[PDB]
Subunit: 346 residues, 3 copies
């Protein structure tokens, strides 16, 4: 009911992508990105039909998580397993890479043992170094400034939930705190693919100024469009998809929450916000986890203190027919599989 | 030297059990339980003969442990591996399911990625929710109120150590603190299979009153018998197996131990207690780990403070010829394999 | 460019080694050790040629790490995977084996489930007990007093970086704190294989006196030679390889560092020390991780406090053409594979 139905150019990309790292969307062309998205669709159809061909048979993959994330971890594990690879999960330890041993040294050892490496952690500088010295494909599971795999999942999902529209024809808005890896990659992604993106939220939390200038140079070339606005009505108008993510921070701070909630509350995605799009076929997306209700411990707590049931999105929207968050969530795997098969596939 | 040697009904169960969750013994019929126990015996013989057929080939299984347990973990891993499945071990993290994200959301994501899920954690309410929303078989590795896999292992072991007696013909006593998952499942198990169980220990630690009433309604139908008594002599008389489990608690409390030890000490299984059964072929069982001696750190500590070498069971009994705790321990795997193959086997 | 090129005796060892544990080099003959080293070379050539035959297909291996060590962990995982085995990684938990449950009990349970077990932890007494009661091959990933796998890797590397010299013809020096597992195994290894070893460092940190006497009894028989000296000039003279390892301790103590650095500094391996060998083909080895520079956090910290850029070895030596630390690091895997295939290989 909801899927993406797509010569010498099929394997021209196979060549370009073989042995490449996957550190950030900025490192790829629009065609290369489309290819990964198309490949994901095949791998997905193959798995469902029970006709998936293993292209990573015999390969060993190291999964470095300096900061735990079950959801991205599973995406890689299941993707690897389906393809015949074996996995070694290296989770958070007492020391972080750099504290007492450098990436340069770490990269060089893992590279001798494994065929591919996944890193999920801190600064992009770190993965970039791992990428430079490992000698095997390195893939960014998430850094402070970027989160590429997520966006592949997001665009595949958008294509699957459109009736024959290309990414170049889609319009979408991201509401909330865009000054982060998700916000950044969604903008680069939107730019690279010639989409119409709108970052709706407080000016202080729009993405990096330099990054926006860089992404707008790209947009101009791909026929895409980027608009940054604090005005919800104007921002969500006519969009095909609405997207948000938790904008509070577990930990700091008691009153920083009073403050934070006050600043971000106007941007929660609620039914009222979907109605402002003037598009009844509008779909809601969220990278997850979402604080969409009154049932978690931190949810009852937010309810008692701010009288709110859900922060960035309401339970009504989250469990609505417009919500496609779980298709989106599943797509992390098919897209991550695409990245591995394309770069390391034999 | 010690094993279980057992039409249209063979596959009538195959049907009933396909796609089922395995949350508690209360959810199954006596025939269904017997089937799982019989299947385990085949899988065990197959592995030993080097003729095991993989019925989970290609399947990916998620192992959720909110509270670590190497012994149940290994049982699942080795069972999965022997059957051609791949495994993702998700151990204890900073937050527990519910603190900041609900099972409803968690279940729905894992269900899209994995083919089967194992949960080991807190309240039964939690696994039940996972079972309702995952969309794939869910198996209870242990909750506060039940521990079904353990009992399958226990009954298989009983059958293996009997000379042609059916579970319906066995008599056994559980000494100690029965107000817990092990005590509960042993009672439901005993009831479902028409056995003669006797919970020997302080009235305050007999199982839940409602549960006992429920299990006695069952017993009456299966021709089983449940008796709860504080009298050891009367309780262990004529039993085929004696069973116990640690009844102290690592942590709370310094004097709660003085108190606890004083209350439970009369129920330790010692040679004197086996002799009270009037049955020289009596066998001792223990789900493990057992504080059976003077060698562990907490063992020397208990020795210096209460002058005891072993709490719930004595070293002499534990290393005696009556002890079958390690066959019992191995059987966790064969029985867990049975549960997975029966519910997810293709 | 750098590799080791080597009847009824080929399989006479196959017999001797089948089902053996690998707890310490003291438990093996010089021929047995050479065999493991030779086997490693084949397994290495096979993997590179893409013609490796799986001799552990279907086997399940438990990896016990009471004290984390990614580098030895990966070595085992990749070795197991390449050979068709499955792995269960049991990392550091709340309690250590012995605190509340004995090895005797633990060994007996794992032995029923797994086909082979790896232990990395505390005292040798512990692995020895695991080795006695598991009933399946047990392998020492590292204990307080020994670290055998590392030395196999080290000797293979030495053979690979020699132009047709046997271990019996090599000369090497270990500079620093030799009173530990690495120092111990290097000495036993050197003795067993008839090498010329020299432990260069403070007399207080020479290996155990009894162990040295034991190793010298061996050396005398194999035509090897062991010399312990505080004199660097005299110690490194004419060596083929120089070897060191971090001699500080993360944690204790602020001034114990002032003290420690002052005592060990004269033994850092710097270009000046390589030149003292009078051998321009000299190669540097280090088990890793090494504090060889000014870039890690603890590195900038050591730079600001003692004005040093690198402790046991200088960046210049570590990244020099003499450094073979990464070939050495890779060889942990090929040698560990050898140990498993030889003992459990079918």
């Amino acid at each position: 009911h909801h899927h993406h139905h797509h010569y010498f150019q099929s394997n021209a990309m196979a060549f370009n992508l073989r042995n490449r790292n996957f550190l950030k969307l900025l490192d790829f062309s629009t065609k290369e990105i489309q290819f990964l998205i198309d490949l994901s669709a095949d791998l997905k159809k193959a798995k469902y039909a029970g006709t998936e061909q293993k292209k990573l048979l015999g390969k060993n993959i190291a999964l470095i998580f300096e900061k735990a994330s079950t959801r991205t971890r599973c995406a890689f594990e299941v993707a690897a397993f389906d393809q015949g690879a074996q996995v070694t999960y290296i989770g958070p330890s007492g020391s972080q890479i750099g504290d007492k041993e450098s990436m340069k040294d770490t990269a060089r050892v893992l590279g001798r043992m494994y065929d591919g490496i996944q890193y999920r952690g801190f600064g992009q500088a770190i993965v970039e170094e791992l990428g430079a010295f490992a000698g095997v494909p390195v893939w960014n599971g998430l850094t402070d400034e970027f989160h590429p795999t997520q966006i592949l999942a997001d665009f595949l999902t958008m294509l699957e939930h459109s009736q024959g529209k290309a990414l170049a024809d889609i319009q979408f808005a991201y509401l909330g705190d865009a000054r982060n890896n998700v916000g950044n990659s969604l903008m680069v992604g939107a730019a690279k693919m010639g989409m119409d993106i709108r970052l709706v939220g407080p000016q202080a939390y729009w993405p990096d100024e330099e990054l926006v200038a860089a992404c707008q140079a790209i947009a101009k070339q791909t026929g895409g469009k980027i608009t940054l606005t604090e005005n919800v009505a104007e921002g969500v108008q006519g969009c095909d998809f609405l997207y948000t993510d938790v904008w509070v921070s577990m930990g700091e701070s008691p009153e920083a929450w009073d403050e934070r909630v006050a600043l971000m509350k106007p941007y929660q995605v609620n039914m009222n916000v979907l109605k402002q799009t003037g598009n009844p076929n509008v779909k809601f997306m969220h990278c997850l986890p979402a604080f969409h209700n009154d049932e978690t411990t931190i949810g009852k707590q937010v309810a008692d203190k701010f009288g709110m049931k859900g922060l960035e999105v309401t339970e009504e929207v989250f469990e609505s027919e417009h919500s496609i968050v779980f298709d989106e969530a599943e797509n992390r795997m098919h897209t991550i599989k695409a990245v591995m098969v394309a770069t390391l596939g034999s």
